[PDB]
C-alpha cells in the first residue's frame, strides 16, 4: 500500500500521440495519479514529431539515475526523449522513439520468439512498432533499476496490446517490477462483434484461437493474451469487458477498473442557451414547415463514431419509428427531434439546409428592421402621450419587407433529414433506415430526424454550438450500444446534466447498474441487450423514449437535477481509488515480503 | 356538482386597489375561479382612478339584464363602472365608487342601524368607506336579481371584514343570494397579539367584547363578527386563524380555505447561483477589510415581510442568531452566517459607510478588470510572437499605482455597519437595540454577521438593485419565526421559489405544512412549535434548526432545495381551488337547498 521508493510507469501507446480514447484516459488520470505518486509518475509512450512539437516540453532528466539511463540508451543509439507532458498535473513522460528499427529487424524479434514462442508478421506495421516499443520499454525499466543503486521496485502499468509486449519481457527477464495490465478494450471483441452474428450470447461458446486465426489477428491476440497471463494484476475497463476477457483472454480481471473523466466545471444556464441555439437551427431547417410547438419539442441525440451496429443507431432508429407511431395514435402535442451527430464523409452543407438557415436569417433581419421602426414609432407615440395606434405602426415599406419574408418562408418539399449532403446517400446506414422506417419529416410526423454528418464545431454556420454546448442543449441522449467497452460519449453526457439512455452491453451502463439501484429516477435508463433479442430491445427502448416523452416539465427538471448528483460516480478521484487498488494488489503480489497490505 | 345558473360575485376591498395582501389573493384567485364560473364571475370592488387606468380596461355589459342593472345604478346618483381586469383570466369587474356617498350619512348609515343595530363612528375612514361599499354591493346584487329573470343561484363571496357590511345587509334584506364570508385575518387577533402578554394560550379566557371596546375598535369587531354569524358558510384562511375565529368571533369556521399562489415564479438552477453571486458582491463590498471569512462557505439567511418585531418574531431570530454565533465560535467552522433582515422602516438614505464600502468594491472590481484587460492584451501579444508571457514584466508601472490606490482604499478601519441605511431612530430601532444587546456587532471574531436593510429591495436602489424575488432566490435559507401571521405570504413565496423556509405552528402556512407534510424537516420546511413551547425554549429550538442547516453537507443542502421545489404544488391554486369550490357548493346547500343540493366531500 505504501510506496516508499516505488516508481509507477504507465506504459501506453497513447502517451503523447492522440490515437484513441485511451489518450483521454491517460491524460485525465494524470492529475490524480500525480498527487499520489508524486514525481515517481513516469508515462512511457512512442515519441511523435507532432507530440514533441505541441504537447511535450523536453526536460533535463531530473532523477540522476534516470539521466544515466537516458544517456546510456542514447549512447547505445536507441532514441529516448525525456520531457514533461504539458497536460494538467505535468506528468514526466519518457517518450521512447520507435525509430530504432535496426535492432527490431533481427535482434528484438529473435529474442521474442525464443522467449515467448511468439512472432510479429512482416506485413503488420503496428505490431512491429509495438514489439520495438515493448523491447525499448522493458530495456528502459531494466536499465533504470540497474543504473539506480538501491533499486526501487517499480509498478509498470501497460495499458493496451500495443504496450503488452513489454509485460511479457519484463516477467520473462524476471525483472523485479510489479505489473498491472488494463485492457481498455478486447482486441478480439471488436472483430467478433459485427463480424459474427451473435457475439455476446455465444461469448461462452467462442474458440478464441480459431476466430483470431481466421481474421489474421492471431499474432495480436497472442500478444494480448500473453500479457494477460503475465500481468501480476489483470484489470479491465468494465464488467462487460471483463466478461469478454473471461471467455476470451482466459484470465478473470482481478479488479474492475472503470475509466473516468475529470468532471471539473462540466452563473450561465448552458441548457437554456444551448436549447435556444438548437431551436434556431430547427427553425431554419424546417423552412416554414413549423406547424409544431417548439416549447413542447424535445431533442434527443446520439453521437460518437459512425459505427451503425456497434454504437447501436439501429435501436435508436427502429425505436424512433415506433415512438412516431405512439405519438401519432395518441395525438401528443410533444414533438421529438432526434439529432444524430455521427462524424461521416460529406461534400458540403445541403442546398436546402443552407437555404433554410438563410431564410431564418432573412426572417430575423426583417423582424429586426420592422421591430426598430415600430420602436421609433412607439417611442414617438408614447412621448406624445397616446397609446400606439395598431394598424398604423407598420409603414407600406414594412409590408413589402414582410411580404418578401413570408414569400421566403414557403416550401412544398418536406424538410431535409440530413444537414450535410452525403458523398453516398444510398450507402449511409442511418439515412437508409430513416427512409425505410418512414421518417421523411412530413408535417404529419411527430418525430423528425436530423442527421448531422460533420463533427459539430463552433465554426459551422448551421448549429454554431460546439459539441459540448449542443450536448448541454438536448433534453436526452440516446446511446444504445452493442459493443462499447466503455461508453466515453455516454459518460460525457452524464457528467453534463443530460439524462442518457445507455445499455447493459455498454461499460457505462454496467457501471451505472452496479452503482445505482433505481436508475430511471437518476436518468440513466439501461436498455438491456445481453439477455434480450434485438426486436424486444427495440421495444424496450421505445418504452424508455415514450416514458421520457410522457413526463411533466417538472418531472424532467427533477430527472436532470438527479443526474447532476451522479457526476461524482464518474470522477477520477473515486475511479483512481479503483486503480490505486490495482497498483497496491500488484505491489503486494510481486513483492509479498516488501509490501503485504492487501485487505479486501 | 353543476352550477346551471349560479353567478359568482367575489366582493372585496382590494379588487382593483393594492392596499394589502388580500389583493394578491384575488388577483391570483381570479384565474382558477374564472374557469369554474365562466363569464358569471364578477368582482365587486372600490373604484380607484389610478387603479382603474393601470389595471382595468372599461367595457360594456355582456348581459341585457346587466345593462339594466348598470343603468339603474348610474341613474340614482351612483357612479358604478364596469370593465375587464387585465389580470390573468380576464374577469369581468364591477368597480363601484365609494365617492358617490350622496346620502350615506344618516340614510345608508341610518338604515344600517335599524337593520343590524350597528353604528359606525364619524372618525373611522375604513368603516365609513365599508358601509358605503357594503350598501352599494347589497343594492347592486339585489337590483340585479330583481331586474333580471330570477336566478335562484347567485353566490356572493365576501373576502374581508370591510366587505362584510354587504353580507350583513344581504341576508337581512332576505335577498336569495348565497353569501360566503371569508376572514383572511381576525381583526381582534392582530390587536390582541402584541397588545396582550399571552394572546395565544389565553384565547378562550379573553372576553372579546371588553378587549374590542378597550381598543376603540369595537365597531370594526362587531362588523366582522356580524358578517361571520350572517354568512351561511364561514371560511378562514388557516387552521390557526380558525382557532382564533372559534374563540374571538365565537363561531367555528364551517370550512377552512387556504390561500394559494401562482406557479409562474420560475435546469433553471442558474438563479440560486446568479442571485448568490449578486448577494456575494454586496457582502464583499459591505465587509471590506474584514474579509477573512470564506465567501463560498458563507450562508445567507433572511427574514422579510412588513416591519413587525413581535409578529414576524424578529426577536426570536436575533436571539437564535446570537446562540448560533456562540455555537459557531466554540466549534470552529469555515462557514459564516450572514443574516439579512429586509424589513421596511422609516430611514434616511444609505449610510455613508455602507455606500463607501460598495464604492470601494466597485473601484477594486474596476481596477481588477482594467489590469486584467491589460494582462490579457500583453499575454495575447506575447503568445502571438511565440514567447513565454514573462509575468513579472507584464504589469506596467501605471497599473501598479492604480492597484496601490485600490489596496489603500480597502482599508479595514472600523467594523462594518449592521444597517445599510441610517435609521431615523437608530437608538430605539427594535432590531438595532437587540443586535447591540445580543452582541452581534459584525466583529471580526463573530461567525454571524447581521445586515439590516430597512427598505424593500428594488431595482431602482443604487446598492443591491435586486428585485425581492431575485434576492430571495439567492439566499440559502429563509427564517420566518412568525407569531401572529394569519397566512404567511412571505414564507409561501419562498417555498414556491424553492428556498427552504422556517415556519411556525402559529403561522398559517406553518400549520398548513404540518397538516399536509408528515415530516416538515425532510422536505426543507422546518416547523417551530411556538404554540406549545415557551419563548426561550422556542428560541433554543430555532438555534437547533439553524445549527442543523449550518452543519448540513453541501450535497445535502442541494437535495433539500430540490425537495422544496416539489412543495409548490401544495400551495398552487389548482390544488387549493378544491377548498373554495367546496365552500361555494356548501353555501348553495345551506340555504334554499331544493334547487341545488350537493353531499359533502
From Swiss-Prot, chain B:
It is an enzyme of class 2 (transferase). UDP-alpha-D-glucose binds at residues 184, 190, 306, 485, 487-488. It catalyses: [(1->4)-alpha-D-glucosyl](n) + UDP-alpha-D-glucose = [(1->4)-alpha-D-glucosyl](n+1) + UDP + H(+). The keyword Glycosyltransferase applies. Pathway: Glycan biosynthesis; glycogen biosynthesis. Its EC number is 2.4.1.11. GO terms for biological process: glycogen biosynthetic process; heart development. Alpha-D-glucose 6-phosphate binds at residues 267, 269, 272, 276, 476, 557, 561. Expressed in skeletal muscle and most other cell types where glycogen is present. Keywords: Allosteric enzyme, Diabetes mellitus, Disease variant, Glycogen biosynthesis, Glycosyltransferase, Phosphoprotein, Transferase. GO terms for cellular component: cytoplasm; cytosol; inclusion body; membrane. UDP binds at residues 18, 306, 490. GO terms for molecular function: alpha-1,4-glucan glucosyltransferase (UDP-glucose donor) activity; D-glucose binding; glycogen synthase activity, transferring glucose-1-phosphate. Allosteric activation by glucose-6-phosphate. Phosphorylation reduces enzyme activity by constraining a tense conformation of the tetramer through inter-subunit interaction. Phosphorylation reduces the activity towards UDP-glucose. When in the non-phosphorylated state, glycogen synthase does not require glucose-6-phosphate as an allosteric activator; when phosphorylated it does. The modification Phosphoserine is found at residue 387. The keyword Glycoprotein does not apply. Part of the GYS1-GYG1 complex, a heterooctamer composed of a tetramer of GYS1 and 2 dimers of GYG1, where each GYS1 protomer binds to one GYG1 subunit (via GYG1 C-terminus); the GYS1 tetramer may dissociate from GYG1 dimers to continue glycogen polymerization on its own. Belongs to the glycosyltransferase 3 family. Glycogen synthase participates in the glycogen biosynthetic process along with glycogenin and glycogen branching enzyme. Extends the primer composed of a few glucose units formed by glycogenin by adding new glucose units to it. In this context, glycogen synthase transfers the glycosyl residue from UDP-Glc to the non-reducing end of alpha-1,4-glucan. It is linked to Muscle glycogen storage disease 0: Metabolic disorder characterized by fasting hypoglycemia presenting in infancy or early childhood. The role of muscle glycogen is to provide critical energy during bursts of activity and sustained muscle work. This is Glycogen [starch] synthase, muscle.
Amino acid at each position: 500500500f505504501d510506496l516508499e521508493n516505488a516508481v509507477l510507469f504507465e506504459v501506453a501507446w497513447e502517451v503523447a500521440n492522440k490515437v484513441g480514447g485511451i489518450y483521454t484516459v491517460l491524460q485525465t488520470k494524470a492529475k490524480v495519479t500525480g498527487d499520489e505518486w508524486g514525481d515517481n509518475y513516469f508515462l512511457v509512450g512512442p515519441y511523435t514529431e507532432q507530440g514533441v512539437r505541441t504537447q511535450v516540453e523536453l526536460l533535463e532528466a531530473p532523477t540522476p539515475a534516470l539521466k544515466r539511463t537516458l544517456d546510456s540508451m542514447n549512447s547505445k543509439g536507441c532514441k529516448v526523449y525525456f520531457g514533461r507532458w504539458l497536460i494538467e498535473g505535468g506528468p514526466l513522460v519518457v517518450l521512447l522513439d520507435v525509430g530504432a528499427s535496426a535492432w527490431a529487424l533481427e535482434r528484438w524479434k529473435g529474442e521474442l520468439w525464443d522467449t515467448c514462442n511468439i512472432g510479429v508478421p512482416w506485413y503488420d506495421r503496428e505490431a512491429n512498432d509495438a514489439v520495438l516499443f515493448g523491447f525499448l520499454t522493458t530495456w528502459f525499466l531494466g536499465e533504470f533499476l540497474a543504473q539506480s543503486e538501491e533499486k526501487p521496485h517499480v509498478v509498470a502499468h501497460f495499458h493496451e496490446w500495443l504496450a503488452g509486449v513489454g509485460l511479457c519481457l519484463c516477467r520473462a527477464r524476471r525483472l523485479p517490477v510489479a505489473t498491472i495490465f488494463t485492457t481498455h478494450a478486447t482486441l478480439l471483441g471488436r472483430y467478433l462483434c459485427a463480424g459474427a452474428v451473435d457475439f455476446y450470447n455465444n461469448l461462452e461458446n467462442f474458440n478464441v484461437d480459431k476466430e483470431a486465426g481466421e481474421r489474421q489477428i492471431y499474432h495480436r491476440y497472442c500478444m494480448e493474451r500473453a500479457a494477460a497471463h503475465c500481468a501480476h494484476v489483470f484489470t479491465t475497463v468494465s464488467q462487460i469487458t471483463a466478461i469478454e476477457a473471461q471467455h476470451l483472454l482466459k484470465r478473470k480481471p482481478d479488479i474492475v477498473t472503470p475509466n473516468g473523466l475529470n468532471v471539473k466545471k462540466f452563473f450561465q444556464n448552458l441548457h437554456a442557451q444551448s436549447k435556444a441555439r438548437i431551436q434556431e437551427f430547427v427553425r431554419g431547417h424546417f423552412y416554414g414547415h413549423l406547424d409544431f410547438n417548439l416549447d413542447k419539442t424535445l431533442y434527443f441525440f446520439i453521437a460518437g463514431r459512425y459505427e451503425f451496429s456497434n454504437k447501436g443507431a439501429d435501436v435508436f432508429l427502429e425505436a424512433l419509428a415506433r415512438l412516431n407511431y405512439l405519438l401519432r395514435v395518441n395525438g401528443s402535442e410533444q414533438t421529438v427531434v432526434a439529432f444524430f451527430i455521427m462524424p461521416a464523409r460529406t461534400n458540403n452543407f445541403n442546398v436546402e439546409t443552407l437555404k433554410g438557415q438563410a431564410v431564418r436569417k432573412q426572417l430575423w433581419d426583417t423582424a429586426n428592421t420592422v421591430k426598430e421602426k415600430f420602436g421609433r414609432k412607439l417611442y414617438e407615440s408614447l412621448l406624445v402621450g397616446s397609446l400606439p395606434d395598431m394598424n398604423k405602426m407598420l409603414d407600406k415599406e414594412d409590408f413589402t419587407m414582410m411580404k418578401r419574408a413570408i414569400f421566403a418562408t414557403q416550401r412544398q418539399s418536406f424538410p431535409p433529414v440530413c444537414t450535410h449532403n452525403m458523398l453516398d446517400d444510398s450507402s449511409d446506414p442511418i439515412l437508409t433506415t430513416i427512409r425505410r422506417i418512414g421518417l421523411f419529416n412530413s408535417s404529419a410526423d411527430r418525430v423528425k430526424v436530423i442527421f448531422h454528418p460533420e463533427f459539430l464545431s463552433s465554426t459551422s454556420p448551421l448549429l454554431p454550438v460546439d459539441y459540448e454546448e449542443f450536448v448541454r442543449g438536448c433534453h436526452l441522449g440516446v446511446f444504445p450500444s452493442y459493443y462499447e467497452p466503455w461508453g466515453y460519449t455516454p459518460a460525457e453526457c452524464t457528467v453534463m446534466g443530460i439524462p442518457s439512455i445507455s445499455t447493459n452491453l455498454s461499460g457505462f451502463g454496467c457501471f451505472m447498474e452496479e452503482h445505482i439501484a433505481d436508475p430511471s429516477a437518476y436518468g440513466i435508463y439501461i436498455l438491456d441487450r445481453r439477455f434480450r433479442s434485438l426486436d424486444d430491445s427495440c421495444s424496450q427502448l421505445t418504452s424508455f423514449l415514450y416514458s421520457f416523452c410522457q413526463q411533466s416539465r417538472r418531472q424532467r427538471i427533477i430527472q436532470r437535477n438527479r443526474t447532476e448528483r451522479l457526476s461524482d460516480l464518474l470522477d477520477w478521484k473515486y475511479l483512481g481509488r479503483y486503480y490505486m487498488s490495482a497498483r497496491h494488489m500488484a505491489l503486494s503480489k510481486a513483492f509479498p515480503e516488501h509490501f503485504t497490505y492487501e485487505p479486501n
